[PDB]
Amino acid sequence: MFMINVLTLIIPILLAVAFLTLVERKVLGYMQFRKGPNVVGPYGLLQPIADAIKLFIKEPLRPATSSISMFILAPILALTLALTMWIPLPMPYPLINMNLGVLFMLAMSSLAVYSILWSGWASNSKYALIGALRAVAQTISYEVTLAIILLSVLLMNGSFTLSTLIITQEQVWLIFPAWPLAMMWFISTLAETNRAPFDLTEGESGFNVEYAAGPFALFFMAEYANIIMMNIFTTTLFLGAFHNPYMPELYTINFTIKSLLLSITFLWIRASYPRFRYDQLMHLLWKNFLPLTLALCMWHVSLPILLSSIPPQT
Amino acid sequence: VAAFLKNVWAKEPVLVASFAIAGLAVILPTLSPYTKYSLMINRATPYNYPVPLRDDGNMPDVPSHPQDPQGPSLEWLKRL
Amino acid sequence: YPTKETAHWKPPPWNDVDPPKSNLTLNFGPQGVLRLVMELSGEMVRKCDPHIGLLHRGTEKLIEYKTYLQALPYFDRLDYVSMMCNEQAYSLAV
Amino acid sequence: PFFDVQKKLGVDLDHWMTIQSAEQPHRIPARCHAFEKEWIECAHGIGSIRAEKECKIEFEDFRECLLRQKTMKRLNAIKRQRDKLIKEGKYTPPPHHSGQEDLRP
Amino acid sequence: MMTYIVFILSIIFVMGFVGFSSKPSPIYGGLGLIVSGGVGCGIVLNFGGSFLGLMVFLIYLGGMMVVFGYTTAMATEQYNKVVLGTFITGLLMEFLMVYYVLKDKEVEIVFKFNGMGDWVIYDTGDSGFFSEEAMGIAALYSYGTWLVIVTGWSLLIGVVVIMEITRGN
Amino acid sequence: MNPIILIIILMTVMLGTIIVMISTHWLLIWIGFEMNMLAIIPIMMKKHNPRATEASTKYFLTQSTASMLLMMAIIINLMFSGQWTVMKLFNPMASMLMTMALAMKLGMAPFHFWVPEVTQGIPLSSGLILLTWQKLAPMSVLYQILPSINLDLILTLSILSITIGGWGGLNQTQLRKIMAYSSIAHMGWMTAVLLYNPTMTLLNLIIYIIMTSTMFTLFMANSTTTTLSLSHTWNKAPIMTILVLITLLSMGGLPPLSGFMPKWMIIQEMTKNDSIILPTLMAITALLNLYFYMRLTYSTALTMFPSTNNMKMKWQFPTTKRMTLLPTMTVLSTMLLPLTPILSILE
Amino acid sequence: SMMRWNRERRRLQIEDFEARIALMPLLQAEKDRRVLQMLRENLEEEATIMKDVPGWKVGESVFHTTRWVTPMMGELYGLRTGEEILSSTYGFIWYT
Amino acid sequence: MSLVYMNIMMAFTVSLTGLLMYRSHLMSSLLCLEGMMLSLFILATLMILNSHFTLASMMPIILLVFAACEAALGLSLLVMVSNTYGTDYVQNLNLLQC
Amino acid sequence: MNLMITLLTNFTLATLLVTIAFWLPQLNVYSEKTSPDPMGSARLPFSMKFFLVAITFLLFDLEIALLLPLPWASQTTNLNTMLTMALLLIFLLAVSLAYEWTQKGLEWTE
Amino acid sequence: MWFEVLPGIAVMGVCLFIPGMATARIHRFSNGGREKRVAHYSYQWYLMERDRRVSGVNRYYVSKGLENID
Ligand SMILES: CCCCCCCCCCCCCCCCCC(=O)OC[C@H](COP(=O)([O-])OCC[N+](C)(C)C)OC(=O)CCCCCCCCCCCCCCCCC
Ligand SMILES: CCCCCCCCCCCCCCCCCC(=O)OC[C@H](COP(=O)(O)OCCN)OC(=O)CCCCCCCCCCCCCCCCC
Ligand SMILES: CCCCCCCCCCCCCCCCCC(=O)OC[C@H](COP(=O)(O)OCCN)OC(=O)CCCCCCCCCCCCCCCCC
Ligand SMILES: CCCCCCCCCCCCCCCCCC(=O)OC[C@H](COP(=O)(O)OCCN)OC(=O)CCCCCCCCCCCCCCCCC
Ligand SMILES: CCCCCCCCCCCCCCCCCC(=O)OC[C@H](COP(=O)(O)OCCN)OC(=O)CCCCCCCCCCCCCCCCC
Numbered sequence A: 001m002f003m004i005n006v007l008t009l010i011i012p013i014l015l016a017v018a019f020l021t022l023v024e025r026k027v028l029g030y031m032q033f034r035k036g037p038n039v040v041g042p043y044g045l046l047q048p049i050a051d052a053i054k055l056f057i058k059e060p061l062r063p064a065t066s067s068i069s070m071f072i073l074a075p076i077l078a079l080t081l082a083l084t085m086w087i088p089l090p091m092p093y094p095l096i097n098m099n100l101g102v103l104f105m106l107a108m109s110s111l112a113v114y115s116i117l118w119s120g121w122a123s124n125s126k127y128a129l130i131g132a133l134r135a136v137a138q139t140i141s142y143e144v145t146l147a148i149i150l151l152s153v154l155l156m157n158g159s160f161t162l163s164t165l166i167i168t169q170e171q172v173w174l175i176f177p178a179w180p181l182a183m184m185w186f187i188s189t190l191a192e193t194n195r196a197p198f199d200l201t202e203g204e205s206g207f208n209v210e211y212a213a214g215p216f217a218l219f220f221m222a223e224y225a226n227i228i229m230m231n232i233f234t235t236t237l238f239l240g241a242f243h244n245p246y247m248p249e250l251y252t253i254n255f256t257i258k259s260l261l262l263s264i265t266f267l268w269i270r271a272s273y274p275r276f277r278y279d280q281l282m283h284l285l286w287k288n289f290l291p292l293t294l295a296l297c298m299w300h301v302s303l304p305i306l307l308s309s310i311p312p313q314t
Numbered sequence B: 001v002a003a004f005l006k007n008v009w010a011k012e013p014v015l016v017a018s019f020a021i022a023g024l025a026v027i028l029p030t031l032s033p034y035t036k037y038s039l040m041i042n043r044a045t046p047y048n049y050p051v052p053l054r055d056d057g058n059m060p061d062v063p064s065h066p067q068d069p070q071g072p073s074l075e076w077l078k079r080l
Numbered sequence C: 001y002p003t004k005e006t007a008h009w010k011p012p013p014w015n016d017v018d019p020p021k022s023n024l025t026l027n028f029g030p031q032g033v034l035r036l037v038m039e040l041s042g043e044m045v046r047k048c049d050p051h052i053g054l055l056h057r058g059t060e061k062l063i064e065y066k067t068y069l070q071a072l073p074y075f076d077r078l079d080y081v082s083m084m085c086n087e088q089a090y091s092l093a094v
Numbered sequence D: 001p002f003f004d005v006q007k008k009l010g011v012d013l014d015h016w017m018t019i020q021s022a023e024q025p026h027r028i029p030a031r032c033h034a035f036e037k038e039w040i041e042c043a044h045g046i047g048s049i050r051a052e053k054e055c056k057i058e059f060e061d062f063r064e065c066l067l068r069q070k071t072m073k074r075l076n077a078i079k080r081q082r083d084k085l086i087k088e089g090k091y092t093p094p095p096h097h098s099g100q101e102d103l104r105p
Numbered sequence E: 001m002m003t004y005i006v007f008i009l010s011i012i013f014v015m016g017f018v019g020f021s022s023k024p025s026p027i028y029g030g031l032g033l034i035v036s037g038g039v040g041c042g043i044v045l046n047f048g049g050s051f052l053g054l055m056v057f058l059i060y061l062g063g064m065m066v067v068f069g070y071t072t073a074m075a076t077e078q079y080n081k082v083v084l085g086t087f088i089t090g091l092l093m094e095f096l097m098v099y100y101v102l103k104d105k106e107v108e109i110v111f112k113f114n115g116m117g118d119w120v121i122y123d124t125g126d127s128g129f130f131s132e133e134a135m136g137i138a139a140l141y142s143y144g145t146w147l148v149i150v151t152g153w154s155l156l157i158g159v160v161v162i163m164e165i166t167r168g169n
Numbered sequence F: 001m002n003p004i005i006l007i008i009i010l011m012t013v014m015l016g017t018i019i020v021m022i023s024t025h026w027l028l029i030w031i032g033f034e035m036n037m038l039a040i041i042p043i044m045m046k047k048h049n050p051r052a053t054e055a056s057t058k059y060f061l062t063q064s065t066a067s068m069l070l071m072m073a074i075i076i077n078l079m080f081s082g083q084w085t086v087m088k089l090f091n092p093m094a095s096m097l098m099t100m101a102l103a104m105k106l107g108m109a110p111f112h113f114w115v116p117e118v119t120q121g122i123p124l125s126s127g128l129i130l131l132t133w134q135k136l137a138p139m140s141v142l143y144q145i146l147p148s149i150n151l152d153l154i155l156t157l158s159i160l161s162i163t164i165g166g167w168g169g170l171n172q173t174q175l176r177k178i179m180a181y182s183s184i185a186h187m188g189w190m191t192a193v194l195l196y197n198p199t200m201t202l203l204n205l206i207i208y209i210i211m212t213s214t215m216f217t218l219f220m221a222n223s224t225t226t227t228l229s230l231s232h233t234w235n236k237a238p239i240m241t242i243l244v245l246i247t248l249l250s251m252g253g254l255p256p257l258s259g260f261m262p263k264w265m266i267i268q269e270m271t272k273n274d275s276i277i278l279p280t281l282m283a284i285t286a287l288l289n290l291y292f293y294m295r296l297t298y299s300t301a302l303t304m305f306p307s308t309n310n311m312k313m314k315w316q317f318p319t320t321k322r323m324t325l326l327p328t329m330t331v332l333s334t335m336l337l338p339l340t341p342i343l344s345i346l347e
Numbered sequence G: 001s002m003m004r005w006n007r008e009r010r011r012l013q014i015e016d017f018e019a020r021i022a023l024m025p026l027l028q029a030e031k032d033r034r035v036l037q038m039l040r041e042n043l044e045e046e047a048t049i050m051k052d053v054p055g056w057k058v059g060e061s062v063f064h065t066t067r068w069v070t071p072m073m074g075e076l077y078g079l080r081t082g083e084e085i086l087s088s089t090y091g092f093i094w095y096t
Numbered sequence H: 001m002s003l004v005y006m007n008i009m010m011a012f013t014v015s016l017t018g019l020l021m022y023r024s025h026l027m028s029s030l031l032c033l034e035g036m037m038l039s040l041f042i043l044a045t046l047m048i049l050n051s052h053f054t055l056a057s058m059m060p061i062i063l064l065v066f067a068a069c070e071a072a073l074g075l076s077l078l079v080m081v082s083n084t085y086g087t088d089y090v091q092n093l094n095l096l097q098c
Numbered sequence I: 001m002n003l004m005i006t007l008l009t010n011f012t013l014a015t016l017l018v019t020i021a022f023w024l025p026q027l028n029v030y031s032e033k034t035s036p037d038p039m040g041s042a043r044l045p046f047s048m049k050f051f052l053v054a055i056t057f058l059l060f061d062l063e064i065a066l067l068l069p070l071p072w073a074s075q076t077t078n079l080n081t082m083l084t085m086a087l088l089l090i091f092l093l094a095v096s097l098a099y100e101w102t103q104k105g106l107e108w109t110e
Numbered sequence J: 001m002w003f004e005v006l007p008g009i010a011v012m013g014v015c016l017f018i019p020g021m022a023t024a025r026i027h028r029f030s031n032g033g034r035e036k037r038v039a040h041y042s043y044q045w046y047l048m049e050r051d052r053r054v055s056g057v058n059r060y061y062v063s064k065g066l067e068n069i070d
């Protein structure tokens, strides 16, 4: 019965990642004054199915890897960590209702850089390894502002419990007291997922260009699971919805609409901006977001004390 | 000192906002009338069992019942 | 006291400094079209060597065997986003 | 050279984490609070040479609180003899050691 | 079996160290230490060390071993009997320890060790509306003032020291 | 290096040693050793050559191994005592591991194998810090755990340090390796009397730091790292030959000098405890240290090795080097034996 | 808004903690009778098991003190089934 | 004593003997050193949780932080050796024999 | 226990999809390929700057590890000391950032 | 036009709606028509194990009220 709950979590994750690709191609079509896919299915609804069947019977590139074992373990780790970030998500009830769900998510997203690192070293190209090291350095850079923005917000929560974050936002959204944290958080989640304007794995060859089309589709679907997940986590964190404990589907519809609009905001940002040069997003992290994030971390430490609004522990 | 402020606010407004927010976070808890209430609320929160006292015969400020008048009250927290 | 084991030990340098005993070269190939030989020093570009001729089609030797009307449509295909301007330049020349 | 700066200045730099019986957050007791309090109050001030021989009993009770070697050895003896008598067929467990009795509260 | 699970994780933990103490390459060595960090974290988590376990993930694995793998990736150009023999040696020594302490319910390598499951030595009470480990870590800011001073000074000195010795001038 | 950064890093070295000296918790002991190593690594890499990087790598590996064994001894003390007071240890295994860790941090034999390399790899001032200041914290921890130190272990470390530091310096021509093997032999002398009377341990440490600081200050004031460049000192500055003469005769323990003061007192505290063979063999082995000191005095003061012609240019310039406390340390390392009963200030 | 709502949440936390405090003497009496029940059961089964073993004192304390020691997990659940052992020693750690 | 403590001590000794028997790489030595640190973290953590000694729960984090800072310093030393010889082989660190 | 079931299910689904992605086109018998990089055969050039940003991550991540018990630390009754040490840790992270800034450590990956 | 993208958004939104609705209904099915008991702290687990013992049927969610006393 619990395994039914695990499958009703993880199989709709795979379906929503399948159709996020279609939604991205359609929304980027209409924002680029064209259509998206509308031939393959009715309104293109069979485009992800056709494309998945195409990729799973495409020939393997059959490369020379330094490690066979890390070449197998990098997609396994990417998919496993992409699926374990969902299990504490309170929507309105988490699958695993853990007391440190925020810190668990922060740790399991910190572990996601080994997929990039192991897949880069598993490729024998030195250029793929250099691009992998640039992607890892970008990601661990933006993890700093993830951790500190998240800490500064949870100073208003009182605990690392994700389910308490619904109770925190019953009177107001937490984007009202923490909109600078919210906007730096949103750009930091944009830079965690190698998402445009921070997609330097498509700027002129990434880390996973040496895989077959099947494992490349697995990396791709882990990345889009991370995108949908970080939008849901941002929605829980700043745009927390109303919850009737006798009608949980009201909260589910509300956070689902907000998370869809936030994922479409990711799609709409990649359809609007040029890329950063690599040192420019290093400049954006280390010289712009991190001083503001430390200043607001001091502010959200000292502000519940000066207003007498320290939240409860329990 | 006023030309320096407009100059750095034109060149580097991220750092001006950073040092302004940091300076407010430093000085403002020592200027607020509510900083006393943070301490008062944290010591009013009963994580532990209030272990009773053996009544020797002379403790007029320790109650015999929770609904007795003597003892610490939290009407300041109910009102605020 | 030098033995057979310590018979190859030379003294250390007087300033205790031993001699240290490069920069990246990237061939951005054709994979319009353009070949680039970058000499990079990290992020910085030290040398950029553009190798061209990947669309050298011998146009102006082919002009030498064709009449003026016949050699007009080669100019459509040189600056192939600026067709009638090159037509105009050749027309004004003739 | 233990330059005892903390007692000279009267500051508490690290005495608070030094023993389990010290002041704890929310008055959480250690699992061997009483044994360590007894061993310290026995051994206090009399010096370490006299403390090793005049306070050995409280130190043995406190080490046996910490590591539970005698308790684990006794449970090993009882459980080993119990499974030996199960193997010999001479013992049977009660219903309250099999899970058939609807526990107390 | 499930009453012995922490012990079982510890066995994998020791096997994980024989993964990288045999030193096949620093990259497989890093992988073995990552798997060892995960299973030792699981050992910590199964006593109630939730915050300390997620520090093993976030700071040891997600913070530090990332930098180990990153530095290793910028060396050891990408393309033994000693590693194989030392690995099977450590494997056999650990499973002989397992066999001895499971058939005897006592062993003595350097100290005496019980052979029962380590569930026996726990406490039979509650902590109320807090985690004791959480409140003891939260008292770093109330009781651990000198510890915060020396730790932050060591980290600031660490930043300065890394920028000195990596400069080369 | 930036002078402000140099001052902050040297105050951090001092702060690490102070936190070892003044703290009552084993975690703060380990923290003080970590802070000391972390700050002293750039002092060793001051000049940025491959020899200083090799020396700092070897120093890092040995001190990191010692710090991990120290923390394992601390953690075993927490097992068998449940507390953290910096006092005697409550397990002989923790006592053995902490004695091994501190013997590594002092570089006592047979963990001596980093001391002559690292001292050769670093400049003379950082070698002075390594051979004087980096002894104070582990000798303080040994001073506080001597109710639990095993006798046979610390005496084996002591005699092995004295013999290996005796035979090591007999083959040397580099002055930094000579001072390093002298360091090993003197640490053997300091820990041989630790369980008998730690006041004489403190005496030997202070007299050793005075004599070592005198010799490194002379080596810096003359810019000399080899024997053969120290042999040009009589043609450059004839006073420095007399100073290295009296200080090398003092480090050999020849009376009436001050370096006769510790070892004599050490014998004076080892025969009260009915050990006769042990201080006798220690004092006989100290003749080896005396022998390579006499080799240096023959090369420097008592004969005149031939110089070069360019020395005539160096006659036209006086030494502008800040010879800090060099007359004070020269006096306090030679003429101090009539004040031998001052040692009660260390009780 | 967070000022008003966190102050109300602190009042709600104090109300929950006072409910806990009012329930704690009943829970403490039940827990005391619970652990003495389990120790007396273990003592009687120890008496009926450890008869053949030479020199065995039943109920022999391993402490020289006569002070009440808080019972260990293996002292209470050592003779019982492993299902009750798991559901008394890993359940809160494993609960969701 | 407890059976898990045997395995954590034996893991510390395995990582010790790995750190005390080099093969070629300095990075493998740094990994053995951090395996030693990890085993110390685990053992200290299991004791402090087992004893309910509340204030020492901040102790392993400190034991993490300092030593990870130490690890950072070690990595820098490796890089400087790797900036001298191209590799991190410990047999290139033999200039101080003479 | 439910967490171990969930982790095992996620790992099993990931390993299953990886095995399917690695062995479903292996059933095809396409052809054997011979196929005889911007760098030609040159060794990987070390860049000091990537290592500096990785170590700067590690050091600020240790400072983050110190900062993580603050939502629980605000519940103390020694609030003046807690607030002083909290602002002091964030200030030392800021001073580490400023020293990394002003000594050109954040340059060409700024 | 722009409402051509709404079928894919509807499919993805139903797929995001499914896990929360599923875990709410599975928690109410597995816990007596009510929410799953949240035991973050050992007092909550203590009361929950007390409920499992006082229910008699080894299920904490079987509640016993005034009818279980005289
Ligand atoms: C979570 C829900 C959504 C959240 C909001 C996000 C939705 C909108 C997203 C739009 C698309 C963004 C795409 C990526 C863009 C990346 C580039 C970018 O924006 O860089 C950030 C830029 C970077 O600066 P820059 O690069 O533009 O400027 C040049 C910088 N120098 C000078 C250093 C060369 O700005 C910031 O970093 C600002 C971040 C937020 C700051 C919030 C400040 C709040 C107010 C403080 C106080 C001010 C008043 C004075 C004091 C008063 C005291 C009482
Ligand atoms: C949570 C909900 C998630 C929902 C996800 C999916 C959303 C979109 C679903 C699909 C919508 C309808 C698509 C219809 C496609 C067209 C099918 C068709 O008619 O194919 C015709 C083809 C040839 O037919 P023929 O007879 O030759 O035609 C000549 C006629 N004179 O004949 C054939 O090709 C053979 C028949 C093929 C039929 C395929 C139909 C679509 C299959 C979709 C599978 C997944 C559906 C969702 C599953 C979960 C919910 C149940
Ligand atoms: C190359 C290898 C393969 C790579 C791919 C697969 C591995 C990577 C992806 C999976 C990562 C596994 C993470 C396991 C632990 C996660 C942390 C954790 O347990 O947090 C949740 C929770 C803490 O919160 P709290 O509510 O306080 O605890 C319950 C108390 N009421 O704590 C709990 O609820 C405690 C539950 C019981 C303890 C669970 C222990 C799990 C088993 C040990 C780790 C196994 C994995 C080892 C490898 C990890 C990665 C290297
Ligand atoms: C006291 C409260 C606590 C304070 C500490 C914590 C603050 C939180 C934020 C931490 C920031 C850490 C890094 C700060 C480094 C500052 C030095 C600096 O960056 O100088 C260089 C810069 C010129 O830039 P450049 O060198 O070219 O770098 C590339 C970007 N152009 O030069 C500049 O851009 C000049 C910037 C300096 C002047 C800023 C003035 C701001 C005034 C705000 C209102 C008053 C605030 C009062 C607080 C104290 C101010 C000193
Ligand atoms: C129970 C006991 C408890 C503890 C008691 C106290 C113990 C004190 C131990 C002191 C150890 C001192 C170590 C050396 C000083 C530390 C800093 C240092 O090394 O400074 C040298 C300095 C560096 O300058 P730099 O430019 O780098 O030199 C190279 C030239 N290009 O400058 C130079 O190189 C210039 C040359 C002269 C430097 C000599 C400095 C000597 C100072 C110490 C004197 C001896 C100790 C005090 C007396 C005994 C006390 C016990």
Ligand SMILES: CCCCCCCCCCC1=C(C)C(=O)C(OC)=C(OC)C1=O
Residues within 6 Å of the ligand: A014, A017, A018, A021, A022, A047, A048, A049, A051, A052, A055, A216, A217, A220, A221, I017
């Ligand atoms: C378990 C398998 C589920 C289906 C596979 C993932 C969903 C299909 C995504 C297909 C896809 C699309 C549309 C796509 O556009 C794309 O290019 C950017 C991909 O990466 C290679 C893709 O993988």
